[model samples]
Target chain A: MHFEAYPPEVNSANIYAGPGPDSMLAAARAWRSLDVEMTAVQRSFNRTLLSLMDAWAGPVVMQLMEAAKPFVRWLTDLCVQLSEVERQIHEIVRAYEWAHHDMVPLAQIYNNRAERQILIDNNALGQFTAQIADLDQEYDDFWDEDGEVMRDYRLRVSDALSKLTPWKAPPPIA
Target chain B: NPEALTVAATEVRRIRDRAIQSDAQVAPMTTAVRPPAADLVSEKAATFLVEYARKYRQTIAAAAVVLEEFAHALTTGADKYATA
Candidate 1:
């Protein structure tokens, strides 16, 4: 959707109009589950490759097999990051749902009610606000974590790929 | 300096993209082995299906990790290199 008067550019995130609100929750669960299973599977595969590298795939099969170690580790770490990031997304969505649901009443009720009568709800709402704020901060942290981890992971893989192939090795000629 | 970096970057990206495509082919196979039934197994087939992942623990993990790594390596590399 576009705004007519004063619209900001979309930079960090893609505009998602595809999934509805309920679908978002379902998607979060489904996505996180998929990521979890895939990540776990990948982890197991990495272990196997690490173990079988000596017997199965050796320097004879691929001259670059020895160079696959860091690449393997990088792969493991990358899946781990993706899986973890996905879990974070699921959590953030839930927290946002909760926060969005309670925001208006929390403020308005506290404003409208008598001091003594509103004590319990006020205190509960106070705690909720603080808790949701903490959850909001988690999004900030996830973005930051994702930024750095993904950057390092890609750079590592890029450098490792160069080590594997001759064509990509000119940057590595030093 | 600029030209060397450019070719280096481009080649790295091409390889990275190749890695991504290869891994994508592996990832959707998460459905290949059906989700195991909990409780007791009714038949041998049911039992085997349940035990499938345990049997390929090392193989599945290794293959999965390798595939996942390739996908991420390529995706992240392409994106990062583009910005870089």
Candidate 2:
């Protein structure tokens, strides 16, 4: 079998990290980083599959396409979600506010599952800071914090900001 | 509409729909029981993270390097076809 029996689903549920924001940014960047990298890989996989099809025909085409059709579809869908995820994070930060655009809320969430992010305002930023402040050493191994050739990540989020600006600009405070 | 693609389309539709539904969900919060009493947290976490980040560097880098090489190969191969 070329694929898993069940295709993996990206969690779109949003949850808070208890009463704190300690590693929230780190945690956020980590998975988001992995997601970003995964999409890049997905891109190559799709391109490779598409190229193979274009380069061959008949049995080879059918077999290869059959093997890859699901991957391509999943890749396409997730890529859209990831883009939205990316936008939600970096887009509306100028004024300091963000909300998860996708993912079920904890309360009304029928099936218990969990997930954007945006620049969050002061009050909300407290919870984020709290979340950031509360992070322990365990999260060190939590998720992906890839290097720059692949991506640049927040690896660490500082609760204390030297200058709080809401642009795509790097942390004048990191 | 082959088997794999159909199976995928079905699953993909489900999750995206689930995400949409999730968007409609309203979280219930009643009390101010969170922020905790002693809010002693850590800048020390930076210490631990430094070590963990190092452990995965080589491995993740290994995977990334391979992917980068293959990605280049895919582009090169595709370009070749365009010329061919």
Candidate 3:
């Protein structure tokens, strides 16, 4: 979703408002960076799966099957992570809107909730980071023994993610 | 017996008519307040989605109990004909 400019009154008066056009631009760039990072991770995931499918008929398919369980677990964890991030984003958006409406007390509550959500998201990201490393090690181990299994693992991981991720929406913060 | 059937049918028809009349009154109110209802639904949906995830843990636990019961019945042949 596209971010819109703040209303003139808010831009002129809101304390949290960035210093100038440059600051506004910087904030926008940071948001976009997060968006791109998420998109890139998704794309890489898809590509790995595609490669697996292309090689599924080959000899290493059995080894790939062996890796499937962990791969699926990792992807499932990713789905849970994305869902949580999306929920937090929604909370942040709701809080911002409330604050904008001059419901200071309610907005403060929402903002606090949003902060907690951000921490939750950070924890999820950390878990995801560790899982990604584990998955990478699994891939390397499978390949060192039997290169053909790579395709099988990739296909399973891809299928799992495909099934799980479509239901996800971007976090409101993004 | 025929008279009793007739009375029952008449009562059913009366209730149906009253229900129809109630709808006629309620329909306009629904249309007028639909926008607010839509907003409320959106808010409620968000809340419900979170609640659903929370409650799902309990739901799954209940399901596991049912599944175990089914497994026991199968193993014991207690409901063999039902299974067939």
Candidate 4:
């Protein structure tokens, strides 16, 4: 019932004890699906926004179009990065699966195969940790107060609303 | 496994929160309607603006639901791992 240690330190005692390979693979699959769904949503939103932009003309609409470009690009890049994260996690899961299935091959005379495999698995988990650290940074930047994606999107929205809002202007010369 | 699952749940919840914030940011788009009230944009453009907002909200709502369920699964998965 006890699970082995994972990442930062793959348990030396038993590399295959933790949550097990099944959970890791399932989580990897879930991440893959999430990435696909999110990517589609972002693309759809971008298309809709651009189409609406094309529907209007004038200086404000021009400004809104320009402002929207970076925001759209950022979200698209974010979705791509997320899929890469999913790919890395899939590799990590594979490493664990490999370790579980092939733990008995003889290695250097001094060290047994199990010990060597555990070391290799630990290395894989370490790599995953590094990759995830980078991913977390991206997420932070996207959601942070100064995040350009949010800033740009909000600016575009504000510009659009200002143009849309009905206001009484000074009466023109009669 | 429990530690990893706990971390996953926390991260998923954070993503869900961001999606919720996005919903709020886009909500104002619905106001871009053709009108006797705010008749500035072309009817076609206004109609599409509202529709776009509607679709965006729907998509975000779907994503949020997925995230919520995933978070719950991760939490429960961790609990099960700990007990086992």
Candidate 5:
């Protein structure tokens, strides 16, 4: 049976030698970095949104605030929903880290053995595969666009901002 | 009011720039290198990782576009405020 997979880096004969460990480690770091950067973006954007909302509180922009109500509410809800997405990413990153933890030792063990018998003798590979199955399910169930989470939050915000007549040039304040 | 709007516009533009940079930072992962051991891990997970990366890129890409529009709006809003 032909197994479809990436080519092994060090051991051409080893089906598990290539990116199995490296990818997991790389992915973990990428996910962690992305999460941090996303948090920064969220904080910055939320502050900007809050400033705009607050600006409308002044008497000059006060009358316009009534119509801006829905827009503000929608964006407020967006911050919460996006926060959930960040949380989901965090969960996935944790799983990747654990999986990576199991992978390295198995790779080292397998590399030393000249024969394939080591795979059956050691339960390491088996255990790693089992974990993969769980992660697969988590990936499918979390924050899917087809499910309840709306991926259109940005588009909605854009549309709402476009509708605001007050957002146009107004006679000037501090 | 004009000064305030300009400040908001400047800040919005900076955020948009940072978001755009963030998207590029993730581009490598989105199209990450696939090793031969992929299926050995679990074909399901191998495929899922690919899909997840695609979705991750899409989310960031979509946000960047909206941010671009927002920056433009703020700039125009500030321009109008000053001239008014």
Candidate 6:
């Protein structure tokens, strides 16, 4: 069957044109783009945080931390935004499925895989983010007490943050 | 001067990598012991995992901060070493 673009009036029309196979292929591409965007945002945020952390542990480390304070906040904020975007992408995937019933088979597989991937990615990201947050808390704890142990703890955390990286795929999602 | 700074920077990077790897090992075990049932077992496991993961993430962030500090120290201590 030939497929044509739905009119502007149709609220939920498929935007591409061609045979069933071509249109479905286009739909898949569209869905994939959302995945790509999510991945890009995640990678960029991870890299930025890693680089910033690297600077925080250098020779003029104190000064670097001072400079990085705001950027750290910025990175955290970006992470939150990316999380929201990820949620929205899930919604978009759902909408695409709702628009086409026969597309269920494809959407189901895509969504299942995509969701699993997202959950895994999120789990890893959450782990890393939590670690950073803890280090910050630990630093604050030590900074507040001015005790030798806390001081040493802070130093250890400082060294740790400087070297961290995001987890590779097939991460533990279950 | 540049070479010295580079060496220091490398040392810091190595430390950070090791710390993260050490922490990464812990997360899986935390997840595994978690229970599958949604009742008491599941709740306990879920809580454990979430708390564990949160602490783990915070550790990573802290480590990153320290690394950044190391980079700053390297650049400042030596005039020849350019900050990357």
Q: Top TM-score: which candidate number?
A: 5
The candidate maximizing lDDT is 5
TM-scores for candidates 1 onward, in order: 0.31, 0.28, 0.24, 0.37, 0.51, 0.28
Candidate 6 DockQ, CA atoms: 0.03
Candidate 2 stretches greater than 4 Å from native: A1-19, A84-174, B1-84
Q: Report residue B56 deviation for candidate 6 (angstroms).
A: 1.5
The lowest-lDDT stretch of 10 consecutive residues in candidate 3 chain A is: A165-174
Q: Over the stretch B13-74, how does candidate 4's per-residue lDDT look in tens digits?
A: 76567666655653553334332111111222334445544564665566566557756865
Candidate 5's residue-wise lDDT over A1-174, tens digit each? Answer: 121122222122333344454554465466556656656766776677568667655654444345334544543443444334334433433433343332324343344332334434555658545445444444333213212211132233234323322211111111
Give the Å shift of residue A34 in candidate 6: 36
- Global Cα lDDT for candidate 6: 0.40
Arranged by lDDT, best first: 5, 4, 6, 1, 3, 2
Sort the predicted structures by TM-score, highest score first: 5, 4, 1, 2, 6, 3
Q: Give one digit per residue, the lDDT tens place, for model 1 in A1-174.
A: 111111111111111111223433443354355455556545554544444344335342243334455655554554554354334434434433332232223223233333434444566646555544554454444444434433343343234223321111101100
* lDDT (CA) per prediction: 0.36, 0.32, 0.34, 0.45, 0.47, 0.40
On a 0 to 100 scale, what is the lDDT of residue A160 in model 2? 20
How many backbone clashes does every candidate have?
A: 9, 15, 1, 5, 4, 44
Q: In candidate 1, which residue ranges exceed 4 Å CA deviation? A: A1-21, A47-51, A54-63, A105-174, B1-84
Model 2 Cα lDDT, one tens digit per residue, B1-84: 133233333343333333323222211110111221111112222332333333333333443343344344434544554565
Model 5 stretches with alpha carbons more than 4 Å out: A1-18, A54-56, A59-174, B33-41
Question: Which ten-residue region of model 1 chain B has the weakest summed lDDT?
Answer: B35-44
DockQ of each: 0.03, 0.04, 0.01, 0.02, 0.19, 0.03
Give the DockQ-based CAPRI class for model 2. Answer: incorrect
In candidate 6, how many clashes are counted?
44
lDDT of 6 by residue, A15-99 (tens): 1211222222332343244334434534543454355456445545445446545644544543343234223323333333333
Q: Which lDDT tens digits does candidate 5 get at residues B1-84?
A: 656656666786787678668657866764563532432323333345556556656655665665556566667766887899
Tens-digit lDDT track for model 3 on B7-84?
323432333343234324333322221111112222332344334333433332333343234234323332342345
Give me the displacement of residue A94 in model 2, in angstroms: 12
